[PDB]
Design a protein around this ligand. Structure first.
Ligand SMILES: CC(C)(COP(=O)(O)OP(=O)(O)OC[C@H]1O[C@@H](n2cnc3c(N)ncnc32)[C@H](O)[C@@H]1OP(=O)(O)O)[C@@H](O)C(=O)NCCC(=O)NCCS
Ligand SMILES: CC(C)(COP(=O)(O)OP(=O)(O)OC[C@H]1O[C@@H](n2cnc3c(N)ncnc32)[C@H](O)[C@@H]1OP(=O)(O)O)[C@@H](O)C(=O)NCCC(=O)NCCS
Ligand SMILES: CC(C)(COP(=O)(O)OP(=O)(O)OC[C@H]1O[C@@H](n2cnc3c(N)ncnc32)[C@H](O)[C@@H]1OP(=O)(O)O)[C@@H](O)C(=O)NCCC(=O)NCCS
Ligand SMILES: [Cl-]
Ligand SMILES: [Cl-]
Ligand SMILES: [Cl-]
Lengths: 190, 190, 190
């Protein structure tokens, strides 16, 4: 297996010294740099850069600068995804985002782990844990979502949360560590 | 009522599709972009841009880039307000800041709420809860202040706090959620 | 004593009105601005700016933009230090970082304190508490390290942590406030 293949298979992989992955990260970082220095009202150019970054034709994906990602192509996006300022989709592990998702400012979606043992860590190895963000979700500002976490459809994550564990659907969850506080009634309003 | 008027009255309003509000946000975002790409030692130009953004003649309001706000004109500022890097004054609900206020880096003042029910949320409706920041206050870095919160004059908010509830005056408060730990003696020193 | 000397001696000092310190901060802010607007693939120029900022010849110190520091020369760096996006080394108090250190995105290392009493605070006085970051450490994203804190060699700090107290070596620690959860076995792997 190549190191990319290991990364995508939840295996330890050489994130720091694999040339292919280094080059892919460089591609993404240079696009993010361009995007981050493009006037917010230059709508067409921003759309072009977003679509180049994610290697997809986005449908109402609104990205407020600055933005960061590692690969770009490993973020799978639905439609109507609103990302406020200073977010980071750290996507060595796939980040899948549904439709109608509101992401507050200063949110970090982190799929990367390093070994706890410093000898193995210092060698550059990482293991990526995919993040799944359900459709119909809302994240307050200052949230961190950790590797391997799934947030269920219809759920709301309070500002400042550190999401260490999966959040069931149709739930309001807050805190460090983030815990369900109540269910959300999402039935069709009258 | 116009949607602006609803916003300013603590009513649900169409944040996402109201043209007037969309244009006002665009005004602010373009000024912030200019400010964020102005050399920190270009003192005059930075002052001009700050005053244009907040639609006021500021008196020793120090803004370290980058900075973000939604409207700008809905942040009411006293004198001697020091704002370190990467703050966001999300001001659909008025943010009132007193005199002699020290705001640490990476602080978010969030007045926006969305409906919990995804059907209403997906429609773009928001409700804004004003934030009041007393004079003579200090915020550590990495603080999030939530909608409708008042921090009393003379109070100190520890780094990393998530301020979910009002903080009384002359109090030290820390944590997620942020809780008063002790009173502060602010009497005139000898 | 000059105000710089007071700062470096853990004494109250006039951070806001001392011309020497004001000018030193301006030097650093202008370099950070240049660095933050330099293409990530302009390797040589970025290295030059980093080395100018820290007033040292760095050895594999990787700084992802944007970055911020107050003085630059008061950050003492080992080799193989990886700093992801949006970090701030607030270094009025010396920040000493060992070798083989992985620092996640949106981390703040804060050495500055202000007086709690607003009368003394409003005068501009600060007191700096040095931060020591051991070799062979890993910080998740969204961590804040507070004044005077030491993180021991071989330790790992979980994402979102607010590190209020010293962390012993060879420990995993998480939370707000950050607390040791277990020891880390760092013995030489087979
Ligand atoms: C959680 C949230 C969505 C709604 O809160 P709510 O349902 O109205 O609940 P309340 O505010 O009445 O508080 C419920 C309890 O949870 C706590 N709580 C609420 N939000 C919290 C949060 N983000 N973090 C930690 N605790 C929180 C409250 O302190 C309270 O504790 P108590 O039971 O001891 O009194 C809101 O607090 C929030 O985080 N909003 C996001 C704001 C934001 O980020 N806006 C910008 C992007 S649009
Ligand atoms: C709260 C603060 C202002 C002063 O702390 P303090 O009054 O000296 O109190 P101590 O450090 O002795 O700790 C008091 C207790 O509260 C806790 N605590 C202190 N600051 C805390 C914080 N920010 N978050 C969570 N807990 C905190 C400590 O862990 C300790 O718990 P214990 O009773 O179990 O021992 C300081 O911790 C802080 O947050 N400083 C801001 C630093 C900063 O952001 N600087 C950059 C901008 S200038
Ligand atoms: C702490 C960490 C390093 C490893 O966690 P771990 O050893 O696998 O432990 P677990 O995930 O099994 O959880 C252990 C417990 O601590 C809690 N916990 C774990 N990480 C936590 C964190 N960062 N903050 C708060 N609580 C945390 C869990 O909720 C769990 O609580 P429980 O005992 O009630 O079940 C990981 O959670 C983390 O923070 N990773 C960093 C991710 C990151 O920032 N990546 C980007 C930069 S590379
Ligand atoms: Cl938002
Ligand atoms: Cl500050
Ligand atoms: Cl990292």
């Amino acid at each position: 297996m190549t190191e990319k293949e290991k990364m995508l298979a939840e295996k330890w992989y050489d994130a720091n010294f694999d040339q292919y992955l280094i080059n892919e990260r460089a591609r993404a970082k240079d696009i993010c740099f361009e995007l981050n220095h493009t006037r917010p009202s230059a709508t067409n150019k921003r759309k072009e850069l977003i679509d180049q970054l994610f290697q997809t034709t986005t449908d109402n994906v609104s990205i407020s600068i600055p933005f960061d990602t590692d690969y770009g192509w490993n973020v799978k996006l639905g439609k109507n995804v609103y990302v406020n300022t200073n977010c980071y989709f750290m996507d060595g592990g796939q980040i899948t985002i549904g439709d109608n998702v509101f992401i507050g400012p200063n949110c970090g979606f982190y799929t990367a782990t390093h070994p706890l043992n410093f000898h193995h860590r210092n060698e550059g190895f990482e293991k990526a844990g995919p993040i799944h963000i359900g459709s119909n979700t809302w994240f307050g500002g200052h949230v961190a979502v950790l590797p391997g976490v799934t947030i269920g459809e219809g759920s709301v994550i309070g500002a400042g949360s550190v999401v260490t564990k999966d959040i069931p659907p149709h739930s309001l969850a807050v805190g460090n560590p983030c815990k369900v506080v109540r269910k959300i009634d999402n039935d069709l309003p009258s």
